[PDB]
Amino acid sequence: NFGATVELDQKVYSWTDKVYITIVAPDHNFDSDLVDEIGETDSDPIKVSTRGFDLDNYKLVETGTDTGIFTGEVILTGFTAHDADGDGNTGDATGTTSGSGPTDGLLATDDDDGLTVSFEFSEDETIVGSALIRWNIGEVQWLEASYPASGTGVVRVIDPDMNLDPEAVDNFEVDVWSDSDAGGIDLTVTETNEATGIFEGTVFFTTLDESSGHRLRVSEGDTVTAEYEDNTLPDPYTTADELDITATSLIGT
C-alpha cells in the first residue's frame, strides 16, 4: 500500500500550452527489468480531460526500469474559431484531439477552462490532479528608455497566450510608428525559445529616408510608439474585446 500521487508543472496553464504529468506510483513496478506502462487498459484506465473534450485510455511510461515513476505529456490546442493574431482570417489554433501514446496527446480547449487527470490504480479508487486554463494580458517595453538618432531598436513583448506552438518558435506583427511618420511600420517579433512565450524584434532608425520594412523615420526628441493588440484577454473582458497595449521611448542626442 504505497499510495500514488499526481503532480503538474503549473497551477495555472494557458491554451495551446504543453503539459507534463508525473505519477509516482511505486506499486505498479511489476517487472524490475521492464519499463512499465499504466493507463492503456479497462482494468487500469487514465483519462486527461478539459470541459468538453477528453482523451481516454491514455498511456504513461516509467522513467527508468525499476524507478517506479511514470510520466507523459499532452499538447493543448485551443479552438479553431478565433483570431489571436487579429489579422481577420480564423484558424490560428487548430482544435484537434487524438493520440494514445505517452507524449503524442492532443487536447482541445476553451478560452476559460479547467484541466484534470484521473488515474484508477485499483478498482473503485481514483486519484486526480487539476489545473486552470486562462488567457493573459500582454506586457510591452523597449529595452532602453532613450536611444540615439541613428541606433537600432529592440522591443520585448510578453504574452503567454501567443505560444501557438509549444514545440516551435512563433512570430507575430507588432505595429511601430513615430511622431514624424504616423503610418510607421509593422514589427515582426519572434519567440526566444519554443515554449517561453517571450517575443523580440529589431528596427533600424533612419532620419534622412522613408520608414519602410523595419526602418523608422524619426527626429531629435521624437517619441516612438510600438503597440500590441491583445486578441486573447481574460475576464472581466470578453472573447470579443480588443485591448491595445503600447510602450514608448524618446530619441534624445
The CATH number linked to 51 is 2.60.40
Shared domain check, 214 and 129? no
Shared domain check, 206 and 220? yes
Nearest residue to 219 (alpha-carbon basis) of 186, 169, 179, 247: 179
Q: State the DSSP string of 152-214.
A: EEEEEEE-GGG-S-TTS--EEEEEEEESS-SS-EEEEEEESSTTT-EEEEEEEEESSS---TT
Contact 180, 217 (CB under 8 A): yes
Q: Three-class SS of residue 49? A: strand
Here the contacts of 212-216 (C-beta below 8 Å, separation 24 or greater) are: 212/185, 213/185, 214/185, 214/187, 214/188, 215/185, 216/153, 216/176, 216/177, 216/178, 216/181, 216/184, 216/185
Is 23 exposed, middle or buried (CB count within 10 Å of its CB: 0-12, 13-18, 19+)?
buried
Contact 75, 18 (CB under 8 A): yes
Choosing from 106, 133, 160, the residue where a domain stops is 133
Shared domain check, 148 and 28? no
Shared domain check, 205 and 124? no
C-alpha cell at 34: 521492464
| Residue position matching grid coordinates 481574460 | 234
Euclidean distance between CA atoms 28 and 121, whole angstroms: 8
Residues spanned by the domain of 243: 139-251
Shared domain check, 9 and 98? yes
Choosing from 91, 117, 133, the residue where a domain stops is 133
Shared domain check, 188 and 151? yes
Which residues, in sequence order, are CB contacts of 182 under 8 Å at separation 6+?
none
Q: Three-class SS of residue 93? A: coil
What beta strand segments (E) does the chain contain? 5-8, 12-13, 18-24, 37-38, 46-50, 53-56, 60-62, 69-76, 105-107, 113-122, 125-133, 139-142, 146-147, 152-158, 171-178, 185-191, 198-206, 215-217, 222-230, 243-251
Cited resolution, angstroms? 2.9
Contact 141, 154 (CB under 8 A): no
Shared domain check, 155 and 220? yes
Shared domain check, 117 and 23? yes
Euclidean distance between CA atoms 156 and 52, whole angstroms: 35
Euclidean distance between CA atoms 36 and 20, whole angstroms: 18
Sort strands 171-178 and 185-191 into parallel, antiparallel or unpaired: antiparallel
- Cβ count near 117 (within 10 Å): 25
Shared domain check, 143 and 129? no
Euclidean distance between CA atoms 11 and 15, whole angstroms: 14
Question: Cα–Cα distances in Å, from 143 out to 33, 202, 212, 248, 251?
Answer: 53, 11, 22, 11, 13
Choosing from 109, 133, 157, the residue where a domain stops is 133
Euclidean distance between CA atoms 42 and 54, whole angstroms: 16
Euclidean distance between CA atoms 143 and 224, whole angstroms: 13
The number of domains in the chain is: 2
81 φ/ψ angles, rounded to the nearest 5 degrees: -95, 75
Shared domain check, 225 and 174? yes
Shared domain check, 116 and 144? no
Shared domain check, 158 and 51? no
